[PDB]
């Protein structure tokens, strides 16, 4: 048994190529796996608070409350793009192909390892190991979901990239149902602000526990362990973004006269007047046929209200936004009208020399132009008298209630029966691939995560933990310290993932952007001599296509 | 509670009827010397609490008929004496962190149990 | 954690006095008071300070933040006398202090 090995360790990307335009696009990878032995042994429920925060005037939410079940289990989990992919092989996926469709997955754990410490006391002193047979792993996989779900980025504590180095999984918690409720405040509100805790509805609970769901295949090693595929269910994204705002959404006005000399302040001419112009409109009183006004088959993106925390449950939260920043160059901060702004560590980037610790931040802007841009946006009456005089419309300059901040574009929204806008482009390497689909029956018709959903049901994940060992003492079902072998386990992992893609094709007089290296980054990609790393975030939506 | 020795049983009761918010959950029976002390300040059961010293717990349902239990034994050799309970019953803490705090009003003094 | 001193405080109707109170950890201002009002009892005055209110206002006030407070008196009556008390609210647990003592000069 023990004097074989079943597995094989692959990280390989091959291009495998069908008729017409149709590439599978075949990626695996690996990691090698260490994981310390949970130290807590019961499912434990806390609650977290830190009040002296909002208990002082002011700050909306710089924190809030919550409470969570940790069980002693961990997460080894896929679902990055460094996980499989590398900035070398990014390239050629970027630059030819126009579409994605998700295929499969799967994965499996082969040649596992324990090991043992005893600690000496007249000693040093000295770790001993020895390799110890009969100790045994446990692994818990459900490919029903009942058991409830999260993926893992919302942090990125997910496995680490390259495959030379080792990464951990992260210990497994999901949120409990309590009540909350916060009162605003600000610097000059007095009094108090009567923030208040309030128990939990005992009508809703759910204390999921695997061990009351899902098997567990046990092992001692010579063993090994594999999951079948579970397909997925997907519509497709576009790799190519989309430039046209609502500009260039018609046929543009004819110009009667063409300008003549070469080099330009050289200005063509509408040839008409303002007044006699023929064409659609929809305003008020038109003798007035505009390049801006005039009607367009419909919008692009939609103005949203922004930094606005709407009360739930939780109270304060912030209400997302699906569109990007394209247009506006003058806010910038991180992410103005948002650009969601990745913040990772230690595994990934902050070149892997780093002394101490300190995270790591770049705002990631969009490709796509859709203007949202909020300044220079304002509103007329239905008189149109023009030129219009101060008291007859609005500016972004003027008050709501008398404030400053605010200045009418915290309160508005539009979306109603026009818009649209593109899924969200894939971000990398931080970002997420494939995301569980919500419950009730509306089906929102996107995510600001993912590119990618399963209308059905997504693969599971893949729990493990060490198996549990005592000496000689014991009480049973006793939350009283039983004593324990400390003790911690190693296994490999392997996965596969399959996607299918299609060539782009020229059909323009001009090239095209690309990703390439040059000297802006001319070592973002090559090791540093005491073995730094990096990955520099790389944005990848990078082909412009026609729109209407 | 008691009377009187070592540890026998129940006689805490009150009070019937209208005894507070009901938030799951709440206080306050007095508590205690009065100079002290005391009373960590009840959850409600599988787990949530609780009282400072062990073999205090405490339970009932805040639904009607709106009642207290036990309360308790506990260990009485230390000849104190909190013999009632009457409300209002402020926040309790578990709810409260305001910062806490604050306790208005209280009902029917002296009540005396005996060592 | 908290205790509280001065005592032995023999006064005149309707003067003024200081009584003051020192901790240990950084309290905010939980600091509150409890004053009978003899009757029901302790039947708390002035809530974390200051608010004047219950049962209605400027019997007593309270003023000051962080490890100290300092109580005050302003209009003494035969409808207050005796002992009173302090608390202090942070975390597990509750704590009281204990004391004053201050009974009409007779």
């Known amino acids: 048994g023990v004097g074989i090995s079943t597995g094989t360790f692959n990280n390989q990307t091959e291009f495998k190529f069908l008729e017409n335009g149709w590439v599978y696009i075949t990626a695996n990878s690996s990691r090698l796996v260490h994981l310390n032995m949970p130290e807590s042994e019961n499912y434990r429920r806390v609650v977290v608070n830190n009040m002296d925060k909002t208990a002082v005037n002011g700050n909306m939410a710089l924190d809030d409350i919550h409470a969570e079940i940790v069980t002693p289990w961990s997460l080894v989990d896929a679902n990055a793009w460094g996980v499989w992919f590398n900035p070398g092989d990014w390239q050629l996926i970027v630059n030819t192909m126009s579409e994605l469709h998700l295929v499969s997955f799967e994965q499996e754990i082969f040649n596992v390892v324990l090991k043992t410490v005893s600690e000496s006391a007249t000693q040093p002193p000295t770790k001993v190991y020895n390799n110890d047979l009969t100790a045994s792993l446990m692994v818990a996989l459900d490919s029903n979901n009942t058991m409830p779900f999260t993926p893992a980025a919302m942090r990125s504590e997910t496995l680490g990239f390259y495959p030379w180095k080792p990464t951990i999984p992260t210990p497994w918690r999901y949120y409990f149902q309590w009540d909350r409720t916060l009162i605003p405040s600000h610097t000059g509100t007095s009094g108090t602000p009567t923030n208040i805790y309030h128990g939990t509805d005992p009508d809703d609970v759910q204390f999921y526990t695997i061990e009351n769901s899902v098997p567990v295949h046990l092992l001692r090693t010579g063993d090994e362990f594999a999951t079948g595929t579970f397909f997925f269910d997907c519509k497709p994204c576009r790799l190519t973004h989309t430039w046209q705002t609502n500009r260039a959404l018609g046929l543009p006005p004819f110009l009667n006269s063409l300008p003549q000399s070469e080099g330009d302040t050289n200005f063509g001419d509408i040839g008409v007047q303002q007044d006699k112009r023929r064409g659609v409109t929809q305003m008020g009183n038109t003798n007035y046929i505009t390049e801006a006004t005039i009607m367009r088959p419909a919008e692009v993106g939609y103005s949203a209200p922004y930094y606005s925390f709407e009360a739930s449950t939780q109270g304060p939260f912030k209400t997302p936004i699906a569109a990007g920043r394209g247009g506006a160059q003058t806010d910038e901060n991180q992410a103005a009208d948002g650009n969601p702004r990745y913040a990772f560590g230690r595994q990934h980037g902050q070149k892997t020399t780093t002394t101490g610790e300190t995270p790591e931040r770049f705002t990631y802007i969009a490709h796509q132009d859709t203007g949202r841009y909020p300044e220079g946006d304002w509103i007329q009456n239905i008189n149109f008298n023009l030129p219009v005089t101060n008291d007859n419309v609005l500016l972004p300059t003027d008050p709501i209630g008398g404030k400053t901040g605010i200045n009418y574009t915290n309160i508005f929204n539009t979306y109603g029966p026009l818009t649209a806008l593109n899924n969200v482009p894939p971000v990398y390497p931080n970002g997420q691939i494939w995301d569980k689909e919500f419950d009730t029956d509306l089906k929102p018709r996107l995510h600001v995560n993912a590119p990618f959903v399963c209308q059905n049901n997504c693969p599971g994940q893949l729990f493990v933990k060490v198996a549990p060992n005592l000496t000689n003492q014991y009480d049973p079902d006793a939350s009283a310290n039983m004593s324990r072998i400390v003790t911690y386990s190693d296994f490999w992992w392997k996965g596969k993932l399959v996607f299918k893609a299609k060539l782009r094709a020229s059909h323009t007089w001009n090239p095209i952007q690309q990703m390439s290296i040059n000297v802006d980054n001319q070592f973002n990609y090559v090791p540093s001599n005491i073995g730094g790393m990096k990955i520099v975030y790389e944005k990848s939506q990078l082909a412009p296509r026609k729109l209407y | 509670s008691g009377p009187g020795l070592v540890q026998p049983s129940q006689t805490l009761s009150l009070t019937c009827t209208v005894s507070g918010f009901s938030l799951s959950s709440y206080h306050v029976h007095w508590v205690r010397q009065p100079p002290g002390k005391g009373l960590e300040w009840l959850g409600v059961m599988w787990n949530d609490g609780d009282t400072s010293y062990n073999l205090a717990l405490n339970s009932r349902l805040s639904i009607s008929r709106d009642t207290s239990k036990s309360q308790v034994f506990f260990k009485m050799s230390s000849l104190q004496t909190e013999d009632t309970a009457t409300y209002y019953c402020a926040r309790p803490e578990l709810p409260g962190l305001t910062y806490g705090v604050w306790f208005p009003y209280w009902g029917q003094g002296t009540l005396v149990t005996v060592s | 954690l908290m205790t509280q001193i001065p005592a032995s405080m023999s006064i005149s109707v309707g003067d003024r006095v200081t009584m003051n109170c020192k901790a240990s950890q950084n309290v905010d201002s939980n600091v509150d008071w409890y004053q009978q009002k003899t009757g029901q009892s302790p039947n708390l005055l002035i809530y974390?300070?200051?608010n004047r209110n219950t049962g209605v206002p400027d019997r007593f006030t309270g003023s000051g933040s962080g490890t100290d407070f300092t109580f005050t008196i302003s209009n003494m009556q035969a409808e207050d006398l005796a002992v009173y008390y302090c608390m202090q609210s942070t975390s597990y647990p509750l704590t009281f202090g204990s004391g004053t003592k201050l009974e009409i000069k007779r």
């Open positions: 974390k300070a200051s």
